[PDB]
Amino acid sequence: EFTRFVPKFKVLPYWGNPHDRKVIRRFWSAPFHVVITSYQL
DNA sequence: TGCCGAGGCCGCTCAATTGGTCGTAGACAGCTCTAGCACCGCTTAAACGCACGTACGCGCTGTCCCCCGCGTTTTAACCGCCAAGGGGATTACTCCCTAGTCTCCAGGCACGTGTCAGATATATACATCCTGTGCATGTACTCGGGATATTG
Numbered sequence: 056e057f058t059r060f061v062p063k064f065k066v067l068p069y070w071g072n073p074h075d076r077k078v079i080r081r082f083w084s085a086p087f088h089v090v091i092t093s094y095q096l
Numbered sequence: 097t098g099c100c101g102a103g104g105c106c107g108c109t110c111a112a113t114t115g116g117t118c119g120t121a122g123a124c125a126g127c128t129c130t131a132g133c134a135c136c137g138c139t140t141a142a143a144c145g146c147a148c149g150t151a152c153g154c155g156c157t158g159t160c161c162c163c164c165g166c167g168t169t170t171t172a173a174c175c176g177c178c179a180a181g182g183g184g185a186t187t188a189c190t191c192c193c194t195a196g197t198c199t200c201c202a203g204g205c206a207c208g209t210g211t212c213a214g215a216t217a218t219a220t221a222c223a224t225c226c227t228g229t230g231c232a233t234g235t236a237c238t239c240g241g242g243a244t245a246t247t248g
Contacts, residue, residue, distance in 0.1 A: 073111085084190095095109055 057089065064088045070096060 057066050067079060067090040076096075083090070 093109090 066091060068091075 058063055065088050067083065067084055069076065069079060069092045070092050074078050
């Protein structure tokens with residue numbers, strides 16, 4: 056929905072393996088305009 | 097009474113192990129070496145093991161004779177404990193430096209041969225050093241009496 060309606064923005068996943076979470080934390084260590092997250096994380 | 101508050105059972109979601117499947121890369125097993133030099137077989141003249149009273153050396157033996165063992169219990173603090181406090185050993189993160197890879201590149205030297213000598217072995221003659229024996233004292237010991245040190 057972000058990619059179809061607002062290609063003006065850039066979006067970060069934040070779920071899955073601890074490795075992928077740890078890696079993504081480097082990219083938001085603000086062109087990381089929005090992050091998508093789950094309650095359980 | 098009331099209310100409710102506190103109370104006790106059951107599907108998500110994530111996070112190690114566990115076991116499974118993929119594909120690919122040297123390293124293992126094996127072949128033929130081949131090649132050669134050790135194992136063998138065959139003699140020989142050779143050393144050294146070995147089955148075997150007797151002199152006799154000492155391993156084992158029958159006695160008595162005593163401390164250190166054997167037994168008791170008081171106590172004495174040794175040793176254990178628990179609980180608290182402080183920090184320092186620990187954890188999790190970010191930056192950082194080099195460990196490690198490969199690659200090129202040389203010559204140092206460990207490798208190898210090529211000759212043949214000063215070395216040490218072996219014999220005979222032998223003298224001498226060294227062992228086994230026999231043989232005095234000199235001390236290091238065991239005891240008794242008193243002085244100094246140290247525990248309670």
